[PDB]
Amino acid sequence: DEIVIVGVAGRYPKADDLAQFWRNLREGRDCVEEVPEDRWDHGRFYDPDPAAPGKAYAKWGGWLSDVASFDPMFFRMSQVEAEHIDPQERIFLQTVWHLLEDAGTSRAALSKVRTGVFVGLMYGHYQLYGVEEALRGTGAATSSSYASVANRVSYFFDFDGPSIALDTMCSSSLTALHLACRAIRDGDCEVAVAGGVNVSSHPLKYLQLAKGGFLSTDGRCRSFGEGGDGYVPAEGSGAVLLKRRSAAEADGDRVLAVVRSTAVNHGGAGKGFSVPNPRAQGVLIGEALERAGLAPADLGYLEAHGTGTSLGDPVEITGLVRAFQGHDLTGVRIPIGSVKSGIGHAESAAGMAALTKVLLQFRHQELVPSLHAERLNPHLDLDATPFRLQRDLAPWTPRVDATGRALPRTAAISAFGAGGSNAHVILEESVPPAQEPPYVCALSARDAERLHEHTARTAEFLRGEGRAAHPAAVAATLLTREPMAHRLAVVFDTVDDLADALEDHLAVLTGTASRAAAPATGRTAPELAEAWVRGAPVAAPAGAPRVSLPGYPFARERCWLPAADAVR
Amino acid sequence: DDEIVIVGVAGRYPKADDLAQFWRNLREGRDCVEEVPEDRWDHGRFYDPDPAAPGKAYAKWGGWLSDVASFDPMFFRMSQVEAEHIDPQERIFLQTVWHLLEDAGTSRAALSKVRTGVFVGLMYGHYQLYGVEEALRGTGAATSSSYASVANRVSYFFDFDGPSIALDTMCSSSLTALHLACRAIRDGDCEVAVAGGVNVSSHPLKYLQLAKGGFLSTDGRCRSFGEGGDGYVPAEGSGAVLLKRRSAAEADGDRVLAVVRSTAVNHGGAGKGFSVPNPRAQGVLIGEALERAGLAPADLGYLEAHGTGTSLGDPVEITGLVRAFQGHDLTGVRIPIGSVKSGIGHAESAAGMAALTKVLLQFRHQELVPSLHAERLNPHLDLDATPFRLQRDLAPWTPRVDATGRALPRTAAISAFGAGGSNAHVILEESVPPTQTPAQEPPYVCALSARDAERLHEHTARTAEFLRGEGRAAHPAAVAATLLTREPMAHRLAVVFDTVDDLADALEDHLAGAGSPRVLTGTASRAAAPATGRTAPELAEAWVRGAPVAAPAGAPRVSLPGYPFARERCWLPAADAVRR
Secondary structure, three states: OOOEEEEEEEEEEOOHHHHHHHHHHOOOOOOOOOOOOOOOOHHHHOOOOOOOOOEEEOOEHHHHHHHHEEEEOOOOOOOOOHHHHHHHHHHHHHHHHHHHHOOOOOOOHHOOOOOOEEEEOOOOOOHOOOOOHHHHOOOOOOOOOOOHHHHHHHHOOOOOEEEEEEOOOHHHHHHHHHHHHEEEEEEEOOOEEEEEEOOOOHHHHEEEEEEOOEOHHHHOOOOOEOOOOOOOOOOOOEEEEEEHHHHHHHOOOOOOEEEEEEEEEOOOOOOOOOOOOOHHHHHHHHHHHHOOOOOOHOOOEEOOOOOOOHHHHHHHHHHHHHHHHHOOOOOOOOOEEHHHHHHHHHHHHHHHHHHHHHHHHHOEEEEEEOOOOOOOOOOOOOHHOOOOOOOOEEEEOOOOOOOOOEEEOOEEEEEOOOOOOEEHOOOOOHOOOOOOOOEEEEEOOHHHHHHHHHHHHHHHHHHOOOOOHHHHHHHHHOOOOOOEEEEEEEEEEHHHHHHHHHHHOOOOEEOOOOOOOOOOOOOOHHHHHHHHHHOOOOOOOOOOOOOOOOOOOOOOEEEEOHHHHOOO | OOOEEEEEEEEOOOOOOOHHHHHHHHOOOOOEEEEOOOOOHHHHEEOOOOOOOOEEOOEEEOOOOOOOOEEEOOOOOHHHHHHHEEEEHHHHHHHHHHHHHOOOOHHHHOOOOOOEEEEEEEEOOOOHHOOOOOHHHOHHHHHHHHHHHHHHHHHHOOOOOOOOEEEEEEEHHHHHHHHHHHHHHOOOOOOEEEEEEEEEEOOOOOHHHHHHOEEOOOOOOOOOOOOOOOOEEEEEEEEEEEEEEHHHHHHHOOOOOOOEEEEEEEOOOOOOOOOOHHHHHHHHHHHHHHHHHHHOOOOOOOOOOOOOOOOOOOHHHHHHHHOOOOOOOOOOOOEEEOOOHHHEEEEEHHHHHHHHHHHHHHHHHHHOOOOOOOOOOOOOOOOHOOOOOOOOOEOOHHHHHHHOOEEOOOOEEEEEEEEOOOOEEEEEOOOOOOOOOOOOOEEEEEEEEEEHHHHHHHHHHHHHHHOOOHHHHEEEEHHHHHHOOOOOOOOEEEEEEOOOOHHHHHHHHOOOOOOOEEEEEEEOOOOOOOOOOOHHHHHHHOOOOHHHHHHHHHOOOOOOOOOOOOOOOOOOOOHHOOOO
């Protein structure tokens, strides 16, 4: 019985949800910008001469839209606490809330299974803020506890399986996925959140990375491209929800991917400390394939580590070639790209970024552009291998059998930590297994102001990428979401008319929840829509189809230690 | 079916630079807590005995490692400057792993044919706070405390190409790592594993953070299950164990320290507050661990408790235990309970390692040691309604009998509960040594090496001193055998010897200049002539030329002092700000 992914969520640069992320990837968007003014005054620290001492020669990053915004009330927390904790802890909370909404579940549905939490992190820089003040006695210390990221999730969501934070550098996300799958196979838990987060909250990181000559000079990751002399740091936060295949089937979950294999290892003593070992990479990927029960012949995409380093990208290919020794390579063509070329190197969340792209490419059956490699690296010699860099937007053509019929698509994601820790994962596409009006559309939120923005965004989604939707699916999906105090309901028959109705409210009932409200006076729809608004429970018609609506629009209260302004 | 076992352990704890000293301290019931040392920081700048004072620490105590700045960078192929710029947790853990391999009777090279994983728990990284201003102003370089670096650097240097993972679950980190290491081995990620944890109190910020949250006890003690405990005291430590399938240990003739019957981890979920201990979840965890172990509470010999010494936490721990033992017949069952924290303090990410090490030593010496500061019990635990009795006195660890009235292998259970909710429990079982093949007869060769002459000198001295002290009872063949499992280095010493006393005599002579016809010295050279035969003089002469000598198959082993690393100060110069 194999492990499946049933939900995913995240934020990446220039993308505050996965629908935007998908658009950026199709358009081949370059999401890297210069250091925003509001993080820190990068001039204090900048100097393009890499020989300059105590200075950074690069000034770019993949930035999240706002990393200071948080809804502390929602998460049972004061403002002052929120100002003193790393935004990584804060954002990953929201991410995991959105994960449950994409899976179509909730704290309460998950309360009778044992849920674990595994999250990867590699930097904790926020804690550098306020040290002088706290020592002087005029302030309180900030925290960046890794464990806190996991533990606060486990607390809030009532997950009582393992709660573990791990650092394997760039591979942390996939290591977390690895351990989460093992935790399930071994019985530590039955469901698991596996994720990773990284926020660039402090200039010191840029000084660090420049001093090591790690940063590219043009601020890009030319994944397998010519003239790549480093990478560009990127922010991010993602997570996936994991379950057994059996339990997913039984709960009528939407399966996004089957986890065929995970594997992790380390370079040992190769060329030097924190230099990549082609050999270790090959053994890793080779074992991954054998565990997967899959041949390179059947491999459909390869999401590469793809840092964009002159020497590092070759090492990665050599690595693959080694894992492919002993198999028949003739005729075989495997497309290869890296999400880093679009968003940059999201560090502890790089695997989550890479995993999500693959997840999205499965659902939309397209291969997307990998950027900045018009000219391949001259060290490469790709033509001797099966690998072809996918520079263009293309349909993801499956492969067939003897009998000429199509198979589920496959993909393979690698992530190689700078300090030697490697991870690799093998994914298979999920191929799935009606109901007639009038339907009802329930909505909830913490207060009025949030219910407004929710309704609003839900309305916009019906006009945009979600008019092609099934209105039955839209009712069921919404009825999986956790109900809150301020409620709303509207009976309807088509997407068209639902969006119609709601628009008119904005420019259709509305109530506040009541715990001892009168039960629905019968399954007939306009009786349910009332049952909601007063605050009765009502469960979706089990086994209904489902869709990705927009997640809860959290409040955006600025939380940021004031004594962090000294770097602006 | 194939069990995991522990085949070596190593550690430094407060007032204990090695485990022999640790054992002495546990055995005597030594209180190892002290005031903040002058050479760490000026605690005057931050102390106010009033808890109500804001921006202040109302306590001034900890469990301190004797010296955390010291490192042997040349040994580990790193520059002096690089060393100053990384956290002492990374450096100390490297030496700990080195000493672990020596305690297990193995080496990088012996391990190079199996896949070895590394799993290390940490929860603070304070060294990186130093030198942040200077680095921003272009004056200096950034310090590092990367957690992955602690594992990865071990993996690199020892050539361990299994999983290399650092992890934070706070106080339970060490046992969480033990748990992940055990499952990596079962699942095939590796065959052998290093599991450990490390914690260094490098920066005064921790004491402010903890004072602000009221975590610090006001006397600077962990009064584990004792009256008037009002918090804990931080302590420093580094520890690691080496893990293996039983079959591989038996095959390799390892000394087995304990069988790992079971491990478990979980979380409190949503209980009465973030970071408030949940006895329901503790109960579940322990119950499960007992089940996976195949063990009934009646068979449990000792419980090394979390034992933090808080008024909330200690009664909660007892309630968790009672919850786990519900649904079991507990008639005439009596289980001794204690906590290492009562002697050294709460070693935070290394707490589980201190705890685990304490049990392993108990197994080895078959004694139960005093738990301190509970002359009067905490009256709100109601222990007497339970099986548990605080072990306040040194006492022999009498085993349990069966039906035949035969002695059973001793068992122990160890808990660690992280402040944020991540819990871990482990059940261990003592190992009955296999029947011994017969010892080699004298003479024997004692073969020592070190990276240079000054190191070999210290090593020779430490070895003679051990052989006059606790090592006088060691079988001489065992002393010989053990040293021959150690990785050979450039500077060589050898002695032919019949007994321990006469070996010490020769080593002392060599140290005094007198020297001996019996002591040979030299520096290795490449392709040196191997031994001309297996007599000891022949072996001795080959070793001194640079030739390896094999340890005899099946030989029994003993623990001898580990490699005496050089002690070069590596402390950022900018860190001297926080002192006078």
